Design a protein around this ligand. Structure first.
Ligand SMILES: [Cl-]
Ligand SMILES: [Cl-]
Ligand SMILES: [K+]
Lengths: 368, 5, 365, 5
């Protein structure tokens, strides 16, 4: 009840922003809208949770301090510190059930809830551990995030598969119509392990990465995943389910390969999409010798047609696709040329960067 | 739309 | 119809974007989602409207063309032209009830509605002024306009001519903003109310370029010419309150303070104000301002500022959002506040300029 | 909140 600390604003701002950002989603449970503050030894720990995931930040206390703990409204405390001027010294002390914040001639009195009432952390043990650059995790998530299901009745699809095996880390996401897979080497021999990170967890893991030189350290348990970057520790529950065996649906023997410029292909699909059915978004692809024709029609009987020069020397074919699924892939590919691998008009197509096998995308066609 | 499975 | 024209992509984009402004997602009448296209002589005219206001753009046709007119879906046609590559030549021609757009190896067939189905007034007052002056007049007062107030005449902006000045006024009954600018022309005394969206639309057509703006005010409409764009809006048929009556008559209490320090102090105190009523308190005494705020959880904020004040001590409450709106609109170094008592309005303005003035009514302590 | 009228 006698916690005291003084911290410079810029050493407190990012911790508060990171731990407080995800909070406020459980309005019937007031204490989950608060941050747990703990002063012990020379460290201030800041914890916020929604019971599904948790964010912890450590702040070094260089100025005199006194041990203690409390909980305070997260966003208000963040807004106060961010509203103070650059360079401000933020003196905090507990006085009964009020937390007092002083800086210059700005004084604030916040309401508290006892630290003893804060949900005590999930106790779990790590089963797999590895380190990798932040940029590599950045790439793995961006390459597949868009293919995750949104509010699918199949809860096990509303997340991202994280797969470790040998020297490879792999992410997979699918909604049953389209699939994205991305693999990166990490340089450690790892045991074979597959876990599903919930959608919200993926986003939060995404947003704590600053690309900087700090490495990322991942610990995977049986029911939780943890990411440690610098002075931040993020923990999330795993989705307790089984991801589909995606290897079975990867096109087995695509004998027809098409290559085209990524941008020209994307700008052509994007124009044709304008006159596609606004709900079903169907477009038609006609592939012939070194030529791709894209058409679109809508209930108003309006029509678009695009003809592109491509590299294709296979059987003539027609195949329908949801143009949004196609455009999402081309937007996710940040490359010069793309390769499309086809089988027939009723089978999926595999799309990739022509110059890299790192990421692959499988899109199921439409019956147009 | 056709499905992957 | 015989309408034909071929125009370079970048000559159509800004016209299409401007004429699309008055259109909103999902109109009530299908033709209101279309743009009217008219080819006559060497000009292509594009018009879009929501029946309350209308935007017209003229485009010179140097390439071969044939006269005619039709209407086409605004969003689809703009998206097609903007989706084509930079430098694209856009060929348009009609085939029955469809409008065809060709460029490179891109073909588009759009549905049309007859131009005859596409939706006259006299000018009473006219004047010209720089685009930047109209922009400032609107920016200085727009935020004080009412939003869907049952008093419909407040859901807009007063445009007032008097002597040689053009003046805008906006209020929602709780706060008021007025801005006056000289325009170098002898004007008749006149007053009209422009609806919110017309103000916004007029605001967006100004690019602060070297082209002057030409304004025509009728009895029931206002029109603005900028370059090759013509914007017309109906006026709000109502009586605007006499704003001269609300300027504090004889404010004996004057306060001056740094705008930014004052702004940041109110912003921090607002954090612990009631989330619905946003009330804060000002305690003004000799060269000191104290700002306090509390909320139903009994949390409290206090900010103390050095100011220049010599009037009688007093306490007064305000909606901090109204105060912050004024300080954000004032893009200046120091602010002057003019007070009377705890239950009377306050006048706020830049200490170095009376061009704009802001009047905020206090809250019950 | 008080009104200006
Ligand atoms: Cl510090
Ligand atoms: Cl041209
Ligand atoms: K809840």
């Amino acid at each position: 009840s006698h916690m005291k600390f003084t911290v410079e604003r810029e050493h407190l701002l990012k911790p508060l922003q990171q731990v407080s950002g995800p909070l406020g989603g459980r309005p019937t449970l007031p204490i989950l809208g608060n941050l747990l503050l703990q002063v012990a030894d020379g460290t201030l720990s800041l914890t916020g949770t929604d019971l599904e995931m948790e964010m912890v930040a450590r702040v070094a206390l260089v100025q005199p301090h006194e041990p203690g703990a409390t909980t305070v409204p997260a966003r208000k405390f963040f807004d106060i510190c961010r509203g103070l001027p650059e360079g401000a010294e933020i003196a905090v002390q507990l006085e009964g059930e009020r937390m007092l914040v002083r800086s210059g001639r700005s004084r604030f009195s916040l309401s508290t809830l006892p630290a003893a009432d804060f949900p005590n952390l999930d106790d779990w043990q790590s089963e797999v551990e590895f380190t990798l650059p932040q940029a590599t995790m950045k790439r793995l998530i961006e390459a597949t995030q868009f293919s995750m299901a949104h509010q699918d009745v199949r809860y096990y699809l509303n997340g991202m598969l994280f797969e470790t095996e040998g020297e490879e880390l792999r992410t997979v996401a699918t909604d049953g119509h389209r699939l994205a897979v991305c693999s990166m080497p990490i340089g450690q021999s790892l045991p074979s392990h597959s876990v599903i990170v919930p959608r919200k967890g993926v986003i939060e893991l995404m947003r704590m990465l600053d690309g900087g030189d700090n490495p990322l350290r991942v610990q995977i348990g049986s029911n939780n995943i943890r990411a440690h970057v610098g002075d931040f520790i993020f923990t999330s529950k795993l989705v307790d389910g089984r991801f589909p065996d995606y290897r079975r649906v990867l096109p087995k023997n695509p004998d027809k390969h098409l290559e085209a410029g990524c941008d020209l292909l994307k700008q052509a699909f994007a124009r044709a999409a304008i006159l596609s059915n606004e709900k079903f978004r169907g477009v038609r692809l006609y592939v012939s010798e070194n030529q791709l024709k894209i058409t679109a029609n809508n209930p108003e009987q309006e029509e678009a047609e695009e003809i592109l020069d491509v590299t294709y020397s296979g059987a003539e074919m027609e195949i329908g696709f949801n143009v949004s699924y196609v455009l999402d892939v081309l937007n996710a590919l940040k490359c010069e040329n793309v390769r499309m691998m086809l089988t027939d008009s009723v089978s999926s197509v595999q799309i990739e960067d022509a110059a890299s096998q790192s990421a692959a995308y499988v899109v199921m066609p439409m019956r147009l | 739309q056709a499905x992957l499975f």
